[PDB]
């Protein structure tokens, strides 16, 4: 069993997804307690041209909202902006509100996306946060408001709400405080992503996954100090390695130290030629050490 991207069960989050519409806009929202959060552009008269959010909010009429889980329609008693998200007070407390907290995802970390189409959970899949505050997911018209979440030791964290797609196809969203990841604006403007910085942690993890799968043609037995690696990293768009403590177990199971993989990285970054690793044609940084420790040993 090779390396495949996975998602944590979505059962806890499914009961919180609702359909939110205002006029001709329809997207997904998150119903927790007596609140419903969703992208604010849902109240925009026309999400196709530049939006004056102050005005759209000034002209909003609570009764024009339509919030429903399934057959249960919720009454909106108040609406306010909280960053790029709309926070709606509803007349009913979600009886299936799971125990939860909120937090932001840092570059290189993974989480799950529960993509829904107009209030209906359609799919779930794993993603990894890129350095520019974007993720490579798959969202089609109507999946805005999709929810990102992580389960870390019994704790459910809500961490992402989908807002838009950049011209280059990258997906942009916000945390629940309403701050857009990567600082992008929720406007149909023309904003660029920029050069992404590969996560060294994750790539080293990727290679361990390869070794564990029987591939070692890229093994060099020659090692590169963490210090030398970091200097190289800065000029080649890769993050500086924290230390090697994160892979202690992986280095033991494989017999290859992190320093050896670091040397492999530098050389592999010049190209795989006609060779592949875990069937990929280049370095992959979408899998974290923790993610890889599972998928190979599943001990969490």
């Amino acid at each position: 069993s090779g390396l495949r991207k996975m998602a944590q069960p979505s059962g806890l989050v499914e009961p919180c997804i609702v359909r939110v519409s205002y006029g001709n806009n329809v997207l997904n929202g998150l119903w927790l307690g007596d609140e419903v959060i969703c992208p604010r552009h849902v109240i925009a008269s026309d999400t196709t041209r530049v939006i004056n959010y102050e005005n759209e909010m000034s002209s909003v009429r609570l009764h024009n909202f339509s919030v429903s889980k399934n057959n249960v329609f919720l009454g909106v008693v108040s609406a306010r902006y909280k960053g790029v998200n709309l926070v709606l007070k509803v007349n009913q407390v979600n009886p299936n509100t799971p125990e939860h907290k909120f937090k932001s995802i840092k570059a290189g970390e993974s989480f799950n996306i529960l993509a829904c189409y107009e209030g209906c959970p359609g799919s779930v899949y794993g993603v990894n946060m890129r350095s520019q505050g974007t993720i490579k997911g798959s969202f089609i018209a109507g999946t805005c408001g999709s929810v990102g979440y992580v389960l870390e030791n019994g704790i459910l964290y809500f961490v992402y709400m989908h807002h838009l797609e950049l011209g280059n196809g990258s997906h942009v969203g916000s945390n629940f405080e309403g701050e857009m990841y990567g600082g992008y604006e929720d406007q149909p403007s023309m904003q660029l992503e920029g050069t992404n910085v590969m996560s060294s942690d994750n790539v080293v993890a990727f290679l361990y996954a390869a070794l564990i799968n029987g591939e070692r043609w890229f093994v060099t037995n020659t090692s590169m100090s963490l210090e030398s690696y970091n200097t190289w990293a800065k000029t080649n768009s890769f993050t500086e390695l924290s230390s090697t403590d994160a892979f202690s177990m992986l280095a033991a199971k494989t017999g290859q130290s992190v320093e050896k993989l670091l040397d492999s990285i530098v050389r592999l970054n010049k190209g795989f030629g006609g060779r592949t690793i875990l069937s990929y044609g280049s370095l992959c940084d979408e899998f974290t050490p923790t993610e890889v420790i599972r998928q190979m040993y599943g001990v969490n």
Partner: peptide, 6 residues
């Protein structure tokens, strides 16, 4: 090219 507010 750029953005679409989904």
């Amino acid at each position: 090219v750029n953005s679409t507010l989904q």
